[PDB]
Amino acid sequence: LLVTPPKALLKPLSIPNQLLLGPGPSNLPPRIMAAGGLQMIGSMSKDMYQIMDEIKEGIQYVFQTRNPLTLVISGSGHCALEAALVNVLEPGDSFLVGANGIWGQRAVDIGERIGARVHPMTKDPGGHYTLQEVEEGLAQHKPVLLFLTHGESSTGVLQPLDGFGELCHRYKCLLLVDSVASLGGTPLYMDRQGIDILYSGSQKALNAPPGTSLISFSDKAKKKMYSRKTKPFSFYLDIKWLANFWGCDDQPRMYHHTIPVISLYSLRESLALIAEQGLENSWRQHREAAAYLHGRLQALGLQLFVKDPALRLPTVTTVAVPAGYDWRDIVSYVIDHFDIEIMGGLGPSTGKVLRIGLLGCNATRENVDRVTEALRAALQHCPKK
Amino acid sequence: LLVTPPKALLKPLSIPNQLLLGPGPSNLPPRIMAAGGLQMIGSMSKDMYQIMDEIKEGIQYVFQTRNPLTLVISGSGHCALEAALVNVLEPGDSFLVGANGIWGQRAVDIGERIGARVHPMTKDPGGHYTLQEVEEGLAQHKPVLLFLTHGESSTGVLQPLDGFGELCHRYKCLLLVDSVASLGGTPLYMDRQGIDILYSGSQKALNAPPGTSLISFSDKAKKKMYSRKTKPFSFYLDIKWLANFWGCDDQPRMYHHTIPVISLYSLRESLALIAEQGLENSWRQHREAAAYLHGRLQALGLQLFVKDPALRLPTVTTVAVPAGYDWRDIVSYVIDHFDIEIMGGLGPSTGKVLRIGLLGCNATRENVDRVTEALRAALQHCPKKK
Ligand SMILES: Cc1ncc(COP(=O)(O)O)c(C)c1O
Ligand SMILES: Cc1ncc(COP(=O)(O)O)c(C)c1O
């Protein structure tokens, strides 16, 4: 044979112990690890459908929606975003985007690829959108769809959502919201806030492993996706097929693709955990953990990148890189000496920030203390121009 | 709150003990279960990249390729097929498809959606392509890409592959092969056989959980994907981005999407297990387990759907549904009474066949015997038309 068994593969798997305090993925609690170690069941068995149905109820709970077109996307946060866009948007459709961070920039990229006429509302990192600004975009561009990031994990921003749905609906625009970083960490009410498409991911405050994502569509969104003149560019993400297999339509489930059974166990357990805790209690925990972190970072002489506390995303905090340091030095020091992962910036915030995540079971004052101690040490050991 | 905590989630997760002898997914051996129970590491950590590098080596081993553009797709087998098509095919490209089962039909569907000029070579379930049939399509349709299913798990057919890559190259056509159901279970040699795009899935003979897939691209395929004057319709599956993050190009790894860290542990362990067994040993195991199943099925009075033994896929065996039975009765009998899963047909083979899988750790004499006794029972106790 051309290729021999890889020597490295003949060694056993060995992973380091890391406290993951960046913007995700987050460490896994015991129940979620335990679920990940379970045996397979048939991907189209009655028992699998029951688990799926329970996951659906769980998503409806954490999104606060009664939308029946609610399901799991078999891919990461990006894949749920792509699923929303390739299904809602048809070539030529006007697409208004909140490009105030990497996530709006990604929505622009996807939208251009699938033929939308994309209209970015570009805002410096750290900014958020007002009702006035969005209405100017609706006036100008008459979009079929608005994208807004709820939790801007690249900039640390918590985007207000009240009023945007009603505004979009007046202009016959659908409202698409990214809650990958905000879900479970901060108030969110899909139906009350008139959101038409809402997606999140498994690996942020839910503390499930990365690889799945959560999505829900309103009746107005469904009407668009189900009256397209062309098929979506994606078969894997075609919502008509996915809606059927997830039991969201009035037909028996037909095979589309094999769902990630073991990941669905773990997701089920992550939704059970937050259902046990209670949404509002989870919001409380994150709010207070972030407030504690903010004060500890400030005591170090560090400056929070988002100055208005009301606009700070509890789950991902941005810290202005301290003058004189190489942020890469700080990030490396924190993992190398304290086995804690934090991150620098991303997209427009690249080079400008450090990012510290407080996600679910890892949103604790203990972890705030750990990362604060590690940052303190990095500031006095990392070289300062 | 509009929605209160679902009471069903407040109960513990419980799963039944099922022997999965369908065409996939397969049961997990203990080492793969154990990998899936591990703690997280950073998704862009040095240690993660090492694990990715080892998985890449494991893919190059099981595919038998030295292609540097080899990586995991963060999606099921369908996602790897879509990744191949959306990156290789530009709107208007001629696309020749071996449409001899559901997998060719799905390639047609994707090709149509992404604006290719699709030319199906249609065949009835059980059919396979000869070199002369493919050359007639290559001459008539001038394709930039041919899709062939290697292991046609919906029909039980093993498509010969020798010489198809060379033939395609003579017509300046890329060869894309689906080996989701064949990999590990039957001979396959990506570079030797001139295959330009090869993909497989995690949940068949590798016995990993479903949801990841394996893909490799030749330099000829890479040239086409990196030479197009349109961006692919997908960001999530854009090969330029994926190649970078998987360490296949000249640039620092950039964040694209978060890879499924835990699934990569388990996929890594699955590649380690087959690297421990040895490809050829795995081929022998499957060949012998299937030969045994074929004998035991025929001794029951059942007819194998693929009449030419050389065309029989070891990993997935199609059986004619016996006259007078509702195949649904047989399949439900077997899971309801024995906790054994088998399947009916799929796409064109629906209603025509039962499908029995022998995949990796499940490809054993003991499991052939269990399914044989289950079918014996089902034949004795399922209603037969008057
Ligand atoms: C707000 C936000 N949106 C989208 C994503 C993308 O998720 P993924 O990395 O899982 O594709 C992330 C990581 C995120 O924080
Ligand atoms: C040959 C073959 N191709 C493709 C698929 C689809 O794979 P998945 O369900 O993982 O998307 C299967 C199941 C298969 O046996």
Coordinates of N, CA, C and O in Angstrom, one line a residue, chain A residues 231-284:
Chain A
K231 N -35.0 26.8 -6.0 CA -34.6 26.1 -4.9 C -33.4 26.7 -4.2 O -32.5 27.3 -4.9
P232 N -33.2 26.6 -2.9 CA -32.0 27.0 -2.3 C -30.8 26.4 -2.9 O -30.8 25.3 -3.4
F233 N -29.7 27.1 -2.9 CA -28.4 26.6 -3.4 C -27.9 25.4 -2.6 O -27.0 24.7 -3.1
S234 N -28.4 25.2 -1.4 CA -28.0 24.1 -0.5 C -29.1 23.1 -0.4 O -30.2 23.4 -0.1
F235 N -28.7 21.8 -0.6 CA -29.6 20.7 -0.3 C -29.5 20.3 1.2 O -30.5 20.1 1.9
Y236 N -28.2 20.3 1.7 CA -28.0 20.0 3.1 C -28.7 20.9 4.1 O -29.1 20.5 5.1
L237 N -28.9 22.1 3.6 CA -29.6 23.1 4.5 C -31.0 23.5 4.0 O -31.6 24.5 4.5
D238 N -31.5 22.7 3.1 CA -32.9 23.0 2.6 C -33.9 22.8 3.7 O -34.0 21.8 4.3
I239 N -34.6 23.9 4.0 CA -35.5 23.9 5.2 C -36.7 23.0 5.0 O -37.2 22.5 5.9
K240 N -37.1 22.9 3.7 CA -38.3 22.0 3.5 C -38.0 20.6 3.9 O -38.8 19.9 4.6
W241 N -36.8 20.1 3.5 CA -36.4 18.8 3.9 C -36.1 18.7 5.4 O -36.5 17.7 6.1
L242 N -35.4 19.7 6.0 CA -35.1 19.7 7.4 C -36.4 19.8 8.2 O -36.6 19.1 9.2
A243 N -37.3 20.7 7.8 CA -38.6 20.8 8.5 C -39.3 19.5 8.6 O -39.9 19.1 9.6
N244 N -39.3 18.8 7.5 CA -40.0 17.5 7.5 C -39.4 16.5 8.4 O -40.0 15.8 9.2
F245 N -38.0 16.3 8.3 CA -37.4 15.3 9.2 C -37.5 15.6 10.7 O -37.5 14.7 11.5
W246 N -37.6 16.9 11.0 CA -37.7 17.3 12.4 C -39.1 17.4 12.9 O -39.4 17.9 14.0
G247 N -40.1 16.9 12.1 CA -41.4 16.7 12.5 C -42.2 18.0 12.6 O -43.0 18.2 13.5
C248 N -41.8 19.0 11.8 CA -42.4 20.3 11.9 C -43.5 20.5 10.9 O -44.2 21.6 10.9
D249 N -43.7 19.6 9.9 CA -44.8 19.7 9.0 C -45.7 18.5 9.1 O -45.5 17.6 10.0
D250 N -46.8 18.5 8.4 CA -47.9 17.5 8.5 C -47.7 16.3 7.6 O -48.6 15.8 7.0
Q251 N -46.4 15.9 7.5 CA -46.1 14.7 6.7 C -45.2 13.8 7.6 O -44.4 14.3 8.4
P252 N -45.2 12.5 7.3 CA -44.2 11.6 8.1 C -42.8 11.9 7.7 O -42.5 12.3 6.5
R253 N -41.9 11.8 8.6 CA -40.5 12.2 8.4 C -39.8 11.3 7.4 O -39.9 10.1 7.5
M254 N -39.2 11.9 6.4 CA -38.4 11.2 5.4 C -36.9 11.5 5.6 O -36.5 12.6 6.0
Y255 N -36.1 10.5 5.2 CA -34.7 10.6 5.3 C -34.2 11.8 4.5 O -34.5 11.9 3.3
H256 N -33.4 12.7 5.1 CA -32.7 13.7 4.4 C -31.2 13.5 4.5 O -30.5 13.2 3.5
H257 N -30.6 13.6 5.7 CA -29.2 13.3 6.0 C -29.2 12.7 7.4 O -30.1 12.9 8.2
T258 N -28.1 12.1 7.8 CA -28.0 11.5 9.1 C -27.7 12.5 10.2 O -26.6 13.1 10.1
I259 N -28.6 12.7 11.2 CA -28.3 13.7 12.2 C -27.3 13.2 13.2 O -27.0 12.0 13.2
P260 N -26.6 14.1 13.9 CA -25.4 13.7 14.7 C -25.9 13.2 16.1 O -25.9 13.9 17.1
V261 N -26.3 12.0 16.1 CA -27.0 11.4 17.2 C -26.4 11.7 18.5 O -27.0 12.1 19.5
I262 N -25.1 11.4 18.6 CA -24.4 11.6 20.0 C -24.4 13.1 20.3 O -24.7 13.4 21.5
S263 N -24.2 14.0 19.4 CA -24.2 15.4 19.7 C -25.6 15.8 20.2 O -25.8 16.7 21.0
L264 N -26.7 15.2 19.6 CA -28.0 15.4 20.1 C -28.3 14.9 21.5 O -28.9 15.6 22.3
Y265 N -27.7 13.8 21.9 CA -27.7 13.5 23.3 C -27.2 14.7 24.1 O -27.8 15.1 25.1
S266 N -26.0 15.1 23.8 CA -25.4 16.1 24.6 C -26.1 17.4 24.6 O -26.3 18.1 25.6
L267 N -26.7 17.8 23.4 CA -27.5 19.0 23.3 C -28.7 18.8 24.2 O -29.1 19.8 24.9
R268 N -29.4 17.7 24.1 CA -30.5 17.4 24.9 C -30.2 17.7 26.4 O -30.9 18.4 27.1
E269 N -29.1 17.2 26.8 CA -28.7 17.4 28.2 C -28.4 18.8 28.6 O -28.6 19.3 29.7
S270 N -27.8 19.6 27.6 CA -27.5 21.0 27.9 C -28.8 21.8 28.0 O -28.9 22.7 28.7
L271 N -29.8 21.4 27.2 CA -31.1 22.0 27.3 C -31.9 21.6 28.6 O -32.5 22.5 29.2
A272 N -31.7 20.4 29.0 CA -32.2 20.0 30.3 C -31.6 20.7 31.4 O -32.3 21.1 32.4
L273 N -30.3 21.0 31.4 CA -29.6 21.7 32.4 C -30.2 23.1 32.6 O -30.4 23.6 33.7
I274 N -30.3 23.8 31.5 CA -30.8 25.2 31.6 C -32.3 25.2 31.9 O -32.8 26.2 32.5
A275 N -33.0 24.2 31.5 CA -34.4 24.1 31.9 C -34.6 23.9 33.4 O -35.5 24.4 34.0
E276 N -33.6 23.1 34.0 CA -33.6 22.9 35.4 C -33.2 24.2 36.1 O -33.8 24.5 37.2
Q277 N -32.2 24.9 35.6 CA -31.8 26.2 36.2 C -32.9 27.2 36.2 O -33.1 28.0 37.1
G278 N -33.6 27.3 35.0 CA -34.4 28.4 34.7 C -33.7 29.6 34.0 O -32.7 30.0 34.4
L279 N -34.3 30.0 32.8 CA -33.7 31.0 32.0 C -33.4 32.2 32.9 O -32.3 32.8 32.8
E280 N -34.3 32.8 33.7 CA -34.1 34.0 34.3 C -33.0 33.9 35.4 O -32.2 34.8 35.5
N281 N -32.9 32.7 36.0 CA -31.8 32.5 36.9 C -30.4 32.4 36.1 O -29.4 32.9 36.6
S282 N -30.4 31.8 34.9 CA -29.2 31.8 34.1 C -28.8 33.3 33.8 O -27.7 33.6 33.8
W283 N -29.8 34.1 33.3 CA -29.5 35.5 33.1 C -28.9 36.1 34.3 O -28.0 37.0 34.2
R284 N -29.5 35.9 35.5 CA -29.0 36.5 36.7 C -27.5 36.1 36.9 O -26.7 37.0 37.2

